[PDB]
């Protein structure tokens, strides 16, 4: 796209022992107007792959359509092989690069989570074709406001539990609500483990303390 | 700027040009050829941007030679001028247009001498004398003052010398040498060079 119209904000991501948890808020902003207020910016690709995207929302929907058809078609003949978090991460990097090279990019900052083979996966794919891996992620203003807390915690302890990771995620979502002007107070939280992907409905950070 | 001139007489079409090939504040060459002979009686002079001149002039020459080889006789000066105008105009609105300023001199077995002018927009005229370059402004009024319709070749070279001397005195460029040749009944004839050492 040349100019994004309806955009989302920061997506978070943490990997703990035996799973990956990500989160994002439910809001579509039309350039400083909170136009749509109940949209879902998190996808479930297959039984071990989740995806959350920032930026343009029509681009996110197009990529949802394409990726879903791919997973369907490979699952059709059911020969015993299935796509993986890494295969989907690579496919996405290649498609983003091919779009930037024609000067017609897709305007998202996707995040891939996964859990296959007994160990977790967490990857980052920018619109220009930059891609890497890390034990934590954050896009948009989150890259300035939430990554310091995640790094402060993972410095001391390199491994967390499911409960601690979830607590950390919500503790960061609160500060994003305090300091980001495109943020909203309703968010979803997905989680992938050995049993599959689970998404949780509209949560709130009502743990606010406005002592003015 | 490069310099070009032509003077048509009763049965001759005396022309001239310079020999400098500057690139920048420096001078790269000192004896450069701005005349392209294309037939036993047809001359073509060119100025303008590098690459364009030679690329454009060699194309015209090869097509004229091919016409002769096919048909057993040569093109006339009028046909060559019109062929040149066409080919130059068809490139004007295309993707790569040339920036050449031309002068076609010739002589034919019926109509006699002929001198054609052609700017870079591909507008074709016919004149008893013409000139291209910045020095045209300075030498167009000497020709106006001293030209005659029945002038002889002895006086024509005189008049050309007077023009070149005026350039030597009043131009801010350094153009020391000039080629000179005549096209009469007997084809092209190279003549003595004019130097201002």
């Amino acid at each position: 796209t040349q100019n994004p119209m309806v955009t989302g904000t920061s997506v978070l991501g943490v990997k703990f022992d035996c799973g990956v948890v990500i989160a994002a808020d439910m809001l579509g902003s039309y350039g400083s107007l909170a136009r749509f207020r109940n949209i879902s910016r998190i996808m479930r690709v297959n039984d071990s792959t989740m995806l959350g995207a920032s930026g343009d929302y029509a681009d996110f929907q197009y990529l949802k359509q394409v990726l879903g058809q791919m997973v369907i078609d490979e699952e059709l003949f059911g020969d015993g092989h299935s796509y993986s978090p890494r295969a989907i991460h690579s496919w996405l990097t290649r498609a983003m690069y091919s779009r930037r090279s024609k000067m017609n990019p897709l305007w998202n900052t996707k995040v891939i989570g996964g859990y296959a083979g007994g160990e977790s996966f967490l990857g980052y794919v920018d619109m220009l074709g930059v891609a890497y891996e890390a034990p934590s992620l954050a896009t948009g203003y989150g890259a300035y406001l939430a990554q310091p807390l995640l790094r402060e915690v993972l410095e001391k302890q390199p491994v967390l539990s499911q409960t601690e990771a979830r607590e950390l995620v919500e503790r960061c979502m609160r500060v994003l609500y305090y300091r980001d002007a495109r943020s909203y107070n309703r968010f979803q939280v997905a989680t992938v483990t050995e049993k599959g992907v689970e998404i949780e409905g509209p949560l709130s950070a009502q743990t606010n303390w406005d002592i003015a | 700027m490069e310099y070009l001139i032509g003077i048509q007489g009763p049965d001759y079409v005396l022309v001239a040009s310079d020999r400098v090939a500057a690139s920048n504040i420096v001078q790269m060459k000192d004896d450069h050829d701005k005349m392209f002979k294309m037939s036993e009686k047809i001359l073509l002079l060119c100025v303008g941007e590098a690459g364009d001149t030679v690329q454009f002039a060699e194309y015209i020459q090869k097509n004229v030679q091919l016409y002769k080889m096919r048909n057993g006789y040569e093109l006339s000066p009028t046909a060559a001028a019109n062929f040149t105008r066409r080919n130059l105009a068809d490139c004007l609105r295309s993707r790569t247009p040339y920036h050449v300023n031309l002068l076609l001199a010739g002589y034919d077995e019926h109509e006699g001498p002929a001198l054609y002018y052609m700017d870079y927009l591909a507008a074709l005229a016919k004149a008893p004398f013409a000139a291209h370059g910045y020095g045209a402004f300075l030498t167009l009024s000497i020709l106006d003052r001293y030209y005659t319709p029945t002038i002889s070749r002895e006086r024509a070279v005189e008049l050309l010398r007077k023009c070149l001397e005026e350039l030597q005195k009043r131009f801010i460029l350094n153009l020391p040498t000039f080629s000179v040749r005549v096209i009469d009944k007997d084809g092209i004839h190279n003549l003595e060079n004019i130097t201002f050492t």
Partner: protein, 204 residues
């Protein structure tokens, strides 16, 4: 402007069973004269002429393509073209290049091949035909010859008075234009004659 780069001025006037067309001779570049015998009027038919003004390269190109098409037409049909038919064909030719157009404004003047009824018309650069009944102009001194023709024109004129009026108009029109002059040529298309003349003008 591009159509003021070589100068030029064309004019046509209508009489009683006669037409007249005129032009100037100067050919030059921005501020410098080159020659004084440039041709701007072309004989498309026995009693059918066309005059072109504007960029000289496009004058020449359009004249040549038009002669192409008219030769083919008169060979295929078997007779000569009419003034009205020629105008439509020229408009079609000019409109084929609506984007990236020729910079030339034509003028047509002829006689009906069977009723001997006059015809004058002018077209704009893109091919818009406007037919009049008194006179048309085109060039860089359009306003000057407008002012002259509106005052001097009369209806049902003889060829003599028509020649006098068109000449007296062109002279005083181009005497006030910097990039036009060097003489004027006048064609008079009568029924059985086509008289050509050259006027004595100023050379500054």
């Amino acid at each position: 402007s591009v159509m003021s780069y070589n100068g030029g001025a064309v004019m046509a006037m209508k009489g009683k069973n006669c037409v007249a067309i005129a032009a100037d001779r100067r050919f030059g570049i921005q501020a410098q004269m080159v020659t004084t015998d440039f041709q701007k009027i072309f004989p498309m038919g026995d009693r059918l002429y066309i005059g072109l003004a504007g960029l000289a390269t496009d004058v020449q190109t359009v004249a040549q393509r038009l002669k192409f098409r008219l030769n083919l037409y008169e060979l295929k049909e078997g007779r000569q073209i009419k003034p009205y038919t020629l105008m439509s064909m020229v408009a079609n030719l000019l409109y084929e290049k609506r984007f990236g157009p020729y910079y030339t404004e034509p003028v047509i003047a002829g006689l009906d091949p069977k009723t001997f009824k006059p015809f004058i018309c002018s077209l704009d650069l893109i091919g818009c035909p406007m037919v009049t009944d008194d006179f048309v102009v085109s060039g860089t001194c359009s306003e000057q010859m407008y002012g002259m023709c509106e005052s001097l024109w009369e209806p049902n004129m003889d060829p003599e008075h028509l020649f006098e009026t068109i000449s007296q108009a062109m002279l005083n029109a181009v005497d006030r234009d910097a990039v036009s002059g060097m003489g004027v040529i006048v064609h008079i298309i009568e029924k059985d004659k086509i008289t050509t003349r050259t006027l004595k003008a100023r050379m500054d």
